[PDB]
């Protein structure tokens, strides 16, 4: 499906693509917001007449968006959620149009056995709901989050790039009765400035801050109590894509020492697609930032990557706005938000 049908009806798709390609848009939340806006635009302006055809068109659009940018998972996720929202309503409608038993909320045997309305308003409302959800995640985490950390315990923080994780930390630090020491790993080629900023923020907040280089993780590990990840995207089996550099090794170390590994992200970051390959989804950075000169650097081929992938075996906890979950359970949460056919587009 090309962009021959959408030219004067919807123009913003091109702009979105541009934003994606040259990285004019920054932060997954912003991307999600943009996607939502696009969806709204599509809804308010276009014509349908039929429902299945419309659904197909939407699917095609989603596919196109995916093809334009693979590292934007939030965009995909939101679309999927919207589709799911549509689908249930459609199903409900069909039952009235025609004019059923189930053990649970969803059945497996229903796939094997042979099975005008104001749905537009409902669809519109769905988008609003999604927006609302996106707006506040930290408020639904803090009631569970500020129960784990105790007095005279030491925290270790890889990935300070995420905006949620910092907030979570701050909320914990607010409490007068609670006291903890913070060890911060830097992350050289991608996270350094961000890490520094985080450290500064911590200092401002009036907490004991310890800036640790990437090599000095091993010596302090006898004192380390907990591990927190600043992840960017959550998946099916448990595996997560983290917000750039210095996460994997630390996680491995934690696993070795049997240190508890926590993860805070959100369900809008959660994807119903499987991460079958690390090479396909993870994007690599820039060689120019590491070392100067060009003519001798033809011989010196430098390897540097943005995003990081951590196996589900190391991570045990996934606290979101709804509640505390596991990597062995999060799949069901995704299913509760994205339907069966909506996985493949």
């Amino acid at each position: 499906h090309p962009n021959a049908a959408t030219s004067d009806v919807n123009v913003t798709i091109d702009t979105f693509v541009a934003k994606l390609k040259r990285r004019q848009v920054q932060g997954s939340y912003a991307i999600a917001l943009e996607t939502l806006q696009l969806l709204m635009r599509f809804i308010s302006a276009a014509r349908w007449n039929h429902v299945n055809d419309l659904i197909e068109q939407i699917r095609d659009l989603g596919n196109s968006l995916e093809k334009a940018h693979p590292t934007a998972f939030s965009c995909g996720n939101v679309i999927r959620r919207i589709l799911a929202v549509l689908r249930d309503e459609v199903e409900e409608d069909t039952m009235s149009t025609t004019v059923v038993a189930e053990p649970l909320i969803s059945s497996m045997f229903n796939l094997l056995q042979k099975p005008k309305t104001d749905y537009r308003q409902v669809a519109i409302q769905g988008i609003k709901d999604l927006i609302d959800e996106i707006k506040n995640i930290d408020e639904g985490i803090q009631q569970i989050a500020i129960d784990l950390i105790h007095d005279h315990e030491i925290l270790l923080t890889p990935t300070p790039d995420s905006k949620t994780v910092l907030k979570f930390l701050i909320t914990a630090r607010e409490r007068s009765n609670r006291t903890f020491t913070v060890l911060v790993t830097e992350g050289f080629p991608n996270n350094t400035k961000n890490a520094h900023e985080f450290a500064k923020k911590l200092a401002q907040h009036n907490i004991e801050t310890l800036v640790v280089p990437d090599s000095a993780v091993f010596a302090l590990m006898s004192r380390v109590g907990k591990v927190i990840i600043g992840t960017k995207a959550v998946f099916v089996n448990g595996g997560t894509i983290s917000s750039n550099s210095g996460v994997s090794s630390v996680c491995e170390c934690a696993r070795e020492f049997r240190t508890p590994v926590f993860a805070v992200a959100g369900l809008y970051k959660l994807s119903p697609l499987y991460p079958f390959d690390v090479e396909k989804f993870v994007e690599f950075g820039g060689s120019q930032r590491i070392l100067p000169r060009m003519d001798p650097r033809k011989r010196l081929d430098t390897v540097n990557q943005i995003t990081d992938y951590v196996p589900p075996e190391n991570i045990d906890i996934y606290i979101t706005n709804v509640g505390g979950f596991n990597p062995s359970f999060i799949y069901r949460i995704a299913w509760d938000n994205y339907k069966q056919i909506d996985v493949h587009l």
Partner: protein, 302 residues
């Protein structure tokens, strides 16, 4: 109207059919004789047939799983609470329909499962399961950098058979004894194992050795894979590290001999835990962590 005979009838066939599928078909055929209308005349007879099958069973739990699934499906069927004829017709249809389904499942597998192959990754394949082989062949079809490793299995020379099958493909292969599989840790990128039965937690019943392999994988931090279709689901949970309903010997210290008559006695079927497996391959979309349990819950509701 007999079922053991039907079961026997499938031995030199397969490759195109599927033993459990065949069994299911047989069951369906049995059902459409004594009328699905009268529940007292039918269900009891079905139960009796199942019992007979169990009695005749040597070392198989998958047939039982299939039959119970079929029963569950039948039970589900009558939830329409309308006329008793259409439902019956549907039930009758649903036997050859099941057979038809398998192909579709395979097709589904062969498009999503081909995304897993990475650049220059060496694959070890364990156990005689048709699905895994299909996946392999359809990966060759796709043209992806890959290698195949054969394990020397000993129930009735299975590893050798597997190797031979691989040969008629054109892929370079090397056979490794089950004792020597421990040393191979760095060269093989992904460990692939077929399953004969998937339990509640996500535990796997298969063949001559799986648990050890899983342990090895865990030790080496190499990913462990389970490849299956959608019919091998049992509502069972093992008590110890390895326990199964067996017709053979569960560790028998044979009496004092000189001429050698009985010595080949011990474990033949093994069970592996939920922690070892990192990825699960099935046709029902993409599911891995604890979806089997959920499915079971959906099915039985008890």
């Amino acid at each position: 109207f007999n079922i053991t005979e039907t079961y026997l009838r499938f031995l030199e066939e397969d490759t195109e059919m599927t033993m459990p599928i065949a069994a299911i078909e047989a069951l369906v055929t049995l059902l459409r004789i004594k009328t699905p209308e009268t529940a007292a005349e039918m269900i009891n007879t079905i139960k009796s047939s199942t019992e007979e099958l169990i009695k005749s069973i040597p070392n198989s739990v998958s047939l039982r799983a299939g039959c119970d699934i079929f029963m569950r499906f039948v039970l589900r069927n009558l939830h329409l609470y309308g006329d008793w004829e259409n439902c019956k017709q549907h039930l009758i249809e649903n036997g050859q329909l099941f057979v038809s389904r398998a192909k579709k499942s395979r097709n589904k597998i062969a498009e999503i499962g081909v995304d897993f192959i990475a650049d220059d990754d060496i694959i070890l394949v364990h156990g005689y399961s048709r699905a895994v082989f299909s996946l392999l062949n359809h990966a060759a079809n796709k043209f992806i950098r890959f290698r195949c490793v054969v394990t020397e299995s000993r129930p009735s020379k299975q590893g050798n058979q597997l190797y031979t099958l691989l040969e008629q493909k054109g892929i370079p292969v090397t056979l490794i004894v089950d004792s020597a599989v421990g040393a191979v840790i760095d060269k093989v990128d992904k460990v692939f194992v077929g399953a004969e039965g998937v339990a509640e937690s996500g535990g796997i019943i298969n063949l001559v050795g799986t648990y050890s392999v899983g342990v090895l994988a865990h030790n080496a931090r190499k990913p462990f894979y389970v490849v299956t279709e959608s019919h091998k689901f049992v509502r069972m949970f093992p008590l110890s590290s390895d326990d199964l309903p067996m017709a053979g010997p569960p560790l028998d210290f044979t009496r004092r001999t000189d001429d050698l008559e009985d010595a080949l006695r011990g474990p033949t079927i093994d069970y592996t835990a939920q922690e070892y497996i990192t990825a699960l391959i099935t046709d029902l979309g993409v599911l891995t962590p604890s979806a089997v349990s959920e499915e079971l819950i959906k099915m039985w509701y008890d």
